[PDB]
Amino acid sequence: SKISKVLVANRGEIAVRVIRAAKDAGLASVAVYAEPDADAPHVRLADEAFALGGQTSAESYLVFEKILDAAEKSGANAIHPGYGFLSENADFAQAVIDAGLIWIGPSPQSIRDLGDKVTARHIAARAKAPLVPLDKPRHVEAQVIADQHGNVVVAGTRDCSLQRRFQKLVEEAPAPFLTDAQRKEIHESAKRICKEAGYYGAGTVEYLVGQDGLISFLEVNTRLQVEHPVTEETSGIDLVRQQFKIANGEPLDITEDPTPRGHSFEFRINGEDAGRGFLPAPGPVTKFVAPTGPGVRMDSGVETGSVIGGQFDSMLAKLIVTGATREEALERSRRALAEFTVEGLATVIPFHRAVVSDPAFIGDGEKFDVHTRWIETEWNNTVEPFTPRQTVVVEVGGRRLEVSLPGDL
């Protein structure tokens, strides 16, 4: 059951990520696409790709028989679901398993037992999780790695407290401001919870930290979270490669929780307008200019001339920025967002520029005020909404200036 050819059934940036991971593993990367995505970067990047009919996710990507028939015609050995449509579906996982493809992910039994929140409540209880008995709670997340043998590591704790509509938008690692006692509790509790569940693979435990630092267990995601990069860049673990090992069932070579070497931020570059209440704004990508440079990583499902219809989730790309300290990572994030430009779409880039500037998010350096309601409730939203010249370059005494004047003088 040693992975060889992987059908990555997901669209977008996570498809690109798993294709790249498979290449790094030397595995053969197969992809699949909906009618709108027939030219998307993941489709062109894969070693081969297969077409599926229809336009909605329900036609294109959710149909078990489609994805399994594509794996059959590919002769794919493995399936990977990404972080999207299939990934939480235990019934699909079962169907893949009994089709006999190596399912890169947790047992359907585990996905069910952790999804059934009554059952998951009893799991947490048996695990002796810090269950709840909050105001302005904070969101913190143990990235658990667990093997089929029951070795468990906490690769690092993220913070994901910048949310609107319970969607994350900005994510942080290691979790900025926790007492050592809190971090120890979080780690050990996570290990206990996933062992009590017998979970294996990559995963995440979402915890919610109240004001004054009470911890409530929230949930286990049972999937690779979109948030994965900030714990990759802070720990050094290649989580998807580890996930391939675990699917192989090789022991976890990581014996102990890696000390995080620095600080990292992630920004979800969604196609929605903070001035328009973060409503999607589907349309053309007239230009796309990633901020490739020092301390910056980019992941994207979108490229120059891409067309972004409404059929799928709005998140185009993830910008990941890393430094030796939170201060330095902030400065680098400011520069990276200042240089990153996207044209023709409304994007959350102005909001990210704002919040990375906002004192409320900078904080005192000993504590900060961001809470999961903050973007909804207390951020002074001043991002004004979204939507020829002739441009000439004039040198005045040798000083370079750009001038834009009416295209009709």
Out of 1, 2, 24, 213, name the contact with a second copy by CB under 8 A: 24
Q: Does 293 bind a second copy (CB under 8 A)?
A: yes
Q: Does 362 bind a second copy (CB under 8 A)?
A: no
Q: Does 5 bind a second copy (CB under 8 A)?
A: no
CA distances from 284 to 72, 273, 277, 350, 395 (A): 34, 15, 20, 18, 34
CA distances from 330 to 43, 157, 204, 327 (A): 34, 18, 25, 5
- Which residues, listed in sequence order, are joined to residue 30 by a DSSP beta bridge? 7, 48
Q: Does 294 bind a second copy (CB under 8 A)?
A: yes
Whichever of 44 and 122 has its CB closer to a second copy, that residue is 44
- Footprint (CB under 8 A) of a second copy, residues 217-256: 229, 232, 236-238, 241
Q: How far is the CB of 242 from a second copy (least distance, A)?
A: 10
Tokens of 57: 């996710």
Whichever of 38 and 279 has its CB closer to a second copy, that residue is 38
How many residues in total does the chain contain? 409
Q: Does 12 bind a second copy (CB under 8 A)?
A: no
User: In angstroms, rounded to a whole number, what is the distance separating the alpha carbons of residues 366 and 171?
Assistant: 18
Q: Does 360 bind a second copy (CB under 8 A)?
A: no
Q: Does 405 bind a second copy (CB under 8 A)?
A: yes
Q: Does 394 bind a second copy (CB under 8 A)?
A: yes
Whichever of 198 and 262 has its CB closer to a second copy, that residue is 262
Q: How far is the CB of 30 from a second copy (least distance, A)?
A: 10
- Footprint (CB under 8 A) of a second copy, residues 295-334: 295-300, 323-324, 328, 331-332, 334
CB 32 within 8 A of CB 70: yes
Q: Does 59 bind a second copy (CB under 8 A)?
A: no
Q: HSE (CB half, 13 Å, CA atoms) of 75?
A: 2
Q: Does 50 bind a second copy (CB under 8 A)?
A: yes
E strand intervals along 225-363: 263-270, 272-273, 279-280, 283-284, 287-289, 296-300, 307-308, 315-323, 341-343
Q: Does 404 bind a second copy (CB under 8 A)?
A: yes
Whichever of 181 and 394 has its CB closer to a second copy, that residue is 394
Tokens of 8: 């990555």
Max Cα distance, the chain (Å) = 77
CB 192 within 8 A of CB 152: no
Mask 184-203, x = binds a second copy (CB under 8 A)? --------------------
Q: How far is the CB of 405 from a second copy (least distance, A)?
A: 6
Whichever of 279 and 392 has its CB closer to a second copy, that residue is 392
Q: Does 392 bind a second copy (CB under 8 A)?
A: yes
- Collapsing DSSP states into helix, strand and coil, what is residue 116? coil
Q: Does 137 bind a second copy (CB under 8 A)?
A: no
User: In angstroms, rounded to a whole number, what is the distance separating the alpha carbons of residues 264 and 267?
Assistant: 10
Q: How far is the CB of 404 from a second copy (least distance, A)?
A: 4
Contacts of 60 (CB under 8 A, 6+ apart): 33, 34, 35, 37, 52, 53, 54, 66
What residue ranges bind a second copy (CB under 8 A)?
16-17, 20-21, 23-26, 33, 38, 43, 45, 48-53, 70, 73, 229, 232, 236-238, 241, 261-262, 290, 292-300, 323-324, 328, 331-332, 334-335, 338-339, 389, 392-406, 409
